[PDB]
Write a protein that binds this ligand. Structure first.
Ligand SMILES: [Mg+2]
Ligand SMILES: [Mg+2]
Ligand SMILES: [Mg+2]
Ligand SMILES: [Mg+2]
Ligand SMILES: [Mg+2]
Ligand SMILES: [Mg+2]
Length: 156
RNA sequence: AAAGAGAGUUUGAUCCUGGCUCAGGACGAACGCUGGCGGCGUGCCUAAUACAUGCAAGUCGAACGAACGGAGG
C-alpha cells in the first residue's frame, strides 16, 4: 500500500486589476515502511484538491532507502539549494531525532534509528529536497564490494 | 562503545542573507499563593562594617608552701 502525511499548506496570491486571487499549495510526503518514500507538491483553489494533486505528484517520483539493520549504513549530508541536512546512524532503540519535515520523510521511509541535524534554512520544501538529496549518496556493503571486485568479508 | 530535533517575525505573494524572541537544564538564590510527614545534606553571596554577654589552651606535687581522723600535752 502507501501511507501519506501532510507537511504544510501555504496560501499564495497574485495581483490583478480586479483585486487578488489566492490558492493553496500543499506539500505531501508519501511512502511505505518497506523502504520506499517520495514527496510531492500540489496547487489548487481548495485545500483537499491541493492535497490530492500533491499525493498524485508524489506517487510518480518514488525512491529507495538502504536500511541495513534498521539504521543508516553511514553518515551523509544533503546540499540541495539553501538547505542542509546531516543524517548519521544511531544505536538500536534510540528512536528518530530530526526536524519536522525530516522526521516525516524518515518515518515514512521506514528507518527507526537515525539522528539528523539541519545546518541551513528552515524552508520545508528545501529541507525535504536536502533530505532526499542526502539519501541519494547512501551505500551498501554488497554494492561497493561488487564495484571494487571483492567480497564483504574482505571489505568488512 | 559514543554520536546533534526546532518555531514566530521584513513581502501583495516568493527565495536567500540577518538580527530579535521562545520551547530545556542548573542555583549558597530572592519574591507571591499555599503547606502533611520521614531520611540525607545546605544556610551573610552585601559592610576585611562596629561589637554588648558567656565560653573557646592549658597541664605537671615523681623538683620547693592543705581540712579531718589523729602521737603527745
Ligand atoms: Mg515540479
Ligand atoms: Mg517567539
Ligand atoms: Mg518560598
Ligand atoms: Mg500559608
Ligand atoms: Mg521531609
Ligand atoms: Mg564574607
Amino acid at each position: 500500500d502507501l501511507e501519506e502525511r501532510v507537511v504544510t499548506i501555504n496560501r499564495v496570491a497574485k495581483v490583478v486589476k480586479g483585486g487578488r486571487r489566492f490558492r493553496f499549495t500543499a506539500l505531501v510526503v508519501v511512502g511505505d515502511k518497506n523502504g520506499h518514500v517520495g514527496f510531492g507538491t500540489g496547487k489548487a483553489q481548495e485545500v483537499p484538491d491541493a492535497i490530492r494533486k500533491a499525493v498524485e505528484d508524489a506517487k510518480k517520483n518514488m525512491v529507495f532507502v538502504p536500511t541495513v539493520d534498521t539504521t543508516i549504513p553511514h553518515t551523509v549530508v544533503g546540499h540541495f539549494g539553501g538547505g542542509e541536512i546531516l543524517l548519521k546512524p544511531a544505536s538500536a532503540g534510540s528512536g528518530v531525532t530530526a526536524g519536522g519535515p525530516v522526521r516525516a520523510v524518515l518515518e515514512l521511509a521506514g528507518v527507526a534509528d537515525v539522528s539528523s541535524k539541519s545546518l541551513g534554512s528552515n524552508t520545508p520544501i528545501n529541507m525535504v529536497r536536502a533530505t532526499i538529496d542526502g539519501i541519494k549518496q547512501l551505500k551498501n556493503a554488497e554494492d561497493v564490494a561488487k564495484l571494487r571486485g571483492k567480497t564483504v568479508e574482505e571489505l568488512l
